[PDB]
Scaffold this active site. Structure first.
Site: not given
Ligand SMILES: Nc1ncnc2c1ncn2[C@@H]1O[C@H](COP(=O)(O)OP(=O)(O)O)[C@@H](O)[C@H]1O
Ligand SMILES: [Mg+2]
Ligand SMILES: Nc1ncnc2c1ncn2[C@@H]1O[C@H](COP(=O)(O)OP(=O)(O)OP(=O)(O)O)[C@@H](O)[C@H]1O
Ligand SMILES: Nc1ncnc2c1ncn2[C@@H]1O[C@H](COP(=O)(O)OP(=O)(O)O)[C@@H](O)[C@H]1O
Lengths: 509, 232, 43, 43, 116
Positions: B44, B70-71
């Site tokens: 997300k 969030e963080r």
């Molecule tokens: N487009 C992407 N390419 C590569 N890895 C990705 C991508 N999107 C997410 N990830 C992986 O998934 C992890 C979680 O993404 P994040 O956006 O923080 O998730 P959420 O917001 O759903 O908790 C990232 O830190 C990475 O390891």
């Molecule tokens: Mg997030």
């Protein structure tokens, strides 16, 4: 051994006793049920304040209603009775902090349980805190080394990172966290190990393994075992976190393990259901995400301006940090359960341990398909970041092709060579318990995998090859390993010296 | 209060995002509303940061970014990234993160929306980004029994759809000016029939559903193309 | 005959590198034994 | 070929013999330090 | 209360049972806990009497049985089987039977653990 004059301490204690009357705010216990006590009176008590009972028993005030005070007992409640006295202490819930807790085993309130005398701490601090804000943080780039090849090559942990360790029971979660603690004994990072809900013999075996490997004097152990009250099991991670935040706030670096946050959520569920709070998913309270998120936000890296503001100018030009390794137990590989998905939404990546790879003898058992670090190579040293670019892709080509070794003689050349490189990288990442490797030894093994010096070596003699190579570089090229172990530098001189030593090993040994 | 029915503005002018699955199966509009549904660690925030970076190319007005539950490290990274690349003077930042007591997390999105409403009522075209709108809702869980309310199904507050409607009906474009909004929406335990995303679905123009199975195949940005719809 | 005497010399060199590795691990075990005895004494 | 295979198989035996000497030296030093420890504690 | 942190014995000392499959494949610890699985008629009671006889004769210890939710027919059968195998005087028997209210069936293991 025991002269009689040294027991004159009692006279000095009589000369430092204040016998003047001091005013207290007092109340009376009305009802005791399941660790929850209702108290009449106590009209000056604060929310979160310790309440003194007879017998040295304390409680914490949770429910300040207009005609009664509800308190949760911070210990055994079974000696408390109707009619007994309660006193205010003037103190929001505190633990002792300092460098005097290093080497000691305590309970959740900081009282020692190891039998090595009283703790002479010069400071206390509050258990409940709000983490420092957005402007006071600094981005993570210094390394924390666990000593494992798969963890330090693929999922690197930095100073201030939160990194979850998640998986099924009895597949090595305590082992990875305790070996990450033992690898900090010469690195300057001090350590806190919090055991929540574990058996006492398991805790005593952990502290004996900490003393046998020379890392007990760098480590505070906080213990709340499986037959304690659920209040102490709920409150022990915040107490150990305050103990790590003493070293965070003064420009030093600490590392904390919560060896089950899943048992802390079970204990907080017990406390909330006995207060008749309405539950949600899996009968957990509605604030259960908040239970983990108030804790893990405290693990951070803070800037030099925060450290200069906290010490009033005493510590200048230093950052401080607190790295966390929380541990979550799953049920049969269900990572989409409510508490595991709440903690993934909080940490900066996770290390998944798989039960099938543990049962096939791949003993560090790291599933490289779904383990990730959000900080990544910003925390890593230069030689480790350069040599680990080909490890994950070799393990990726092995995932599906590992079931093809029963017919692999009738395959094309690129598929056969990708599968041979996959078996060699998979056999390289196996590692024993209580055997840490330095920067230079993992760089030697990663260069032996990455540059094609495993190609004429069979699978059952990979790791023995690795051990012999490490021994040869310890007796011939020790100045090269002492050059690599300074700050993990890489250049053409180090490249040429490693490749000349590996070619002389492959030709003469 | 929400703006009236006579003050509503219609429009279907396309907003190109540069991402292939988003431009293919659920396309966006200027002055429209975007949800990015998904479970824990499926992407997300990465998708929103890419949508901020590519929507910033052809947009010249202001932006409001609201961090809701969030963080704290993500807030520091986004502030130092905008300060280093000199786009900080167009963006207003409001933050009430996971470290805060639940009154702050309950009311911080109203503050960011009030700043976006002032920019909309000056006749401008503004962008509003909200990382986790689910975290407003969960803060309304945490105080609900303490306010004396009987629980609804799976322990939620009984006023769930009304608190969602009173927040979501102020986000719209009016005839005075326009708001384009991107909101990340958390899905508890990967269950889309949980009542908080299921009430969130009808407040949006475009819905992008992420999947743990598609990301476990290695495919990013992990969009389920059979679950993502838009009215454009 | 000439390649046979070269094979015998390479056999003796392989044996001598095995004895050098043997003396190394026996020396490292003596250092490990000394520091472990000092740790149990201190305890 | 027989002579070179015999030399590699003898080299593995020399390394395993010194490994058993390594384990005996470290375990006898641990046992002797433990027995002197119980002697001082009983005294 | 439980025994304290300073009262733990230390080590991982094994308890010899004298049974070959138990001492080879799934060895028991002193202070350890053993889950026992399987249905009826495959020799559970005979294994329990052999563990009682082996810990009494070869290790000079005792045994306590605590029957939580004990069926009355099977408790009388188990008592007569332990009279006929000469192992009754090596074990103390506490029953909390099925037709008793559930506080009896809650505290009967604490009673047998107090005698142990
Ligand atoms: N487009 C992407 N390419 C590569 N890895 C990705 C991508 N999107 C997410 N990830 C992986 O998934 C992890 C979680 O993404 P994040 O956006 O923080 O998730 P959420 O917001 O759903 O908790 C990232 O830190 C990475 O390891
Ligand atoms: Mg997030
Ligand atoms: N690298 C390793 N090599 C060999 N054995 C290992 C390794 N790591 C762990 N083990 C073994 O795996 C077993 C389980 O490890 P451990 O007790 O750490 O697991 P856990 O998941 O933390 O379990 P618990 O449920 O008790 O918390 C132990 O007996 C340990 O000796
Ligand atoms: N050690 C043994 N040697 C020979 N037969 C045995 C042994 N253990 C059990 N059996 C056989 O298995 C049957 C079931 O044993 P028992 O322990 O009575 O099971 P349960 O108590 O569940 O009825 C016995 O009748 C006996 O014939």
């Amino acid at each position: 051994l025991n002269p009689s004059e040294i027991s004159e301490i009692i006279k000095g204690r009589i000369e430092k006793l204040d016998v003047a009357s001091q005013a207290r705010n007092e109340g009376t216990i009305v009802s005791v049920s399941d660790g929850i006590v209702r108290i009449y009176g106590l009209a000056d008590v604060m929310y979160g304040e310790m309440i003194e009972f007879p017998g040295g028993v304390y409680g914490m005030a949770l429910n300040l209603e207009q005609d009664s005070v509800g308190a949760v007992v911070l210990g055994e409640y079974q000696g408390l009775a109707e009619g007994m006295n309660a006193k205010c202490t003037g103190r929001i819930l505190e633990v002792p902090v300092g460098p005097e807790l290093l080497g000691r085993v305590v309970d959740a309130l900081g009282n020692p349980i190891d039998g090595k005398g009283p703790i002479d701490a010069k400071a206390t601090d509050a258990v409940e805190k709000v983490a420092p804000g957005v402007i006071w943080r600094k981005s993570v780039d210094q390394p924390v080394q666990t000593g494992y090849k798969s963890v330090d090559a693929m999922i690197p942990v930095g100073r201030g990172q939160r990194e979850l360790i998640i998986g099924d029971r009895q597949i090595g979660k305590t082992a990875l966290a305790v070996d990450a603690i033992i690898n900090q004994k010469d690195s300057g990072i001090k350590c806190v190990y919090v055991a929540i809900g574990q058996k006492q013999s398991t805790i005593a075996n952990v502290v004996r393994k900490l003393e046998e490997n020379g890392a007990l004097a760098n480590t505070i152990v906080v213990a709340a075992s499986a037959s304690e009250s659920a209040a102490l099991q709920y409150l022990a991670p915040y107490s150990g976190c305050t103990m790590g935040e003493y070293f965070r706030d003064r420009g030093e670096d600490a590392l904390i393990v919560y060896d089950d946050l899943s048992k802390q959520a079970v204990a907080y569920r017990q406390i909330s259901l006995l207060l008749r709070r309405p539950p949600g998913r899996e009968a957990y309270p509605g604030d259960v995400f908040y239970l983990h998120s108030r804790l893990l936000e405290r693990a951070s890296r803070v800037s030099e301006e925060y450290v200069e503001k906290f010490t009033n100018g005493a510590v200048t030009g230093k950052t401080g940090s607190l790295t966390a390794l929380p541990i979550i137990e799953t049920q049969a590989g269900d990572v989409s359960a409510f508490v595991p998905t709440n903690v993934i939404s909080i940490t900066d990546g996770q290390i998944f341990l798989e039960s099938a790879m543990f049962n096939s003898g791949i003993r560090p058992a790291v599933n490289a398909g779904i383990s990730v670090s959000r900080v990544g190579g910003a925390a890593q040293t230069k030689i480790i970041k350069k040599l680990s670019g080909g490890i994950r892709t070799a393990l990726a080509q092995y995932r599906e092709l590992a079931a093809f070794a029963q017919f692999a003689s009738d395959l094309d050349e690129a598929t056969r060579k990708q599968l041979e490189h996959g078996q060699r990288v998979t056999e390289l990442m196996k590692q024993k318990q209580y055997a840490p490797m330095s920067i230079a030894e993992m760089s030697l093994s990663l260069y032996a995998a990455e540059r094609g010096f495993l190609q004429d070596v069979e699978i059952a003699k990979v790791g023995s090859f690795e051990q012999a190579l490490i021994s040869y570089f310890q007796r011939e090229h020790a100045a090269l390993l002492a050059k690599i172990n300074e700050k993990g530098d890489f250049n053409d001189e180090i490249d040429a010296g490693i490749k000349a030593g590996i070619e002389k090993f492959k030709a003469t040994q | 209060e929400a703006p009236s029915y006579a003050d509503q503005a219609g429009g279907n002018e396309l907003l190109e995002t540069g991402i292939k699955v988003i431009d293919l199966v659920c396309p966006f509009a200027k002055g429209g509303k975007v949800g990015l549904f998904g479970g824990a660690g499926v992407g997300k925030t990465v998708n929103m940061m890419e949508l901020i970076r590519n929507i910033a190319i052809e947009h010249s007005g202001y932006s409001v970014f609201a961090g809701v539950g969030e963080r704290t490290r993500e807030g520091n990274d986004f502030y130092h990234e905008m300060k280093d690349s000199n786009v900080l003077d167009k963006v207003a930042l409001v933050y009430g993160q996971m470290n805060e007591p639940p009154g702050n997390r309950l009311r911080v999105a109203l503050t960011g929306l009030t700043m976006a409403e002032k920019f909309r009522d000056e006749g401008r075209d503004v962008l509003l980004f909200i990382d986790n709108i689910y975290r407003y809702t969960l803060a309304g869980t945490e105080v609900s029994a303490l306010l004396g309310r009987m629980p609804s199904a799976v322990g939620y507050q009984p006023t769930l759809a009304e608190e969602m409607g009173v927040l979501q009906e102020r986000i719209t474009s009016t005839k005075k000016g326009s708001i384009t909004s991107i909101q990340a929406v958390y899905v508890p335990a990967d269950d889309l029939t949980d009542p908080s995303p299921a009430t969130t679905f009808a407040h949006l123009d475009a819905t992008v559903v992420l999947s743990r199975d598609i990301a476990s195949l290695g495919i990013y940005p992990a969009v389920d193309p059979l679950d993502s719809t838009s009215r454009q | 005959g000439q390649q046979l005497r070269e094979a015998k010399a390479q056999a003796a060199e392989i044996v001598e590198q095995a004895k050098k590795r043997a003396n190394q691990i026996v020396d490292e075990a003596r250092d490990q034994a000394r520091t472990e005895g000092e740790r149990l004494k201190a305890q």
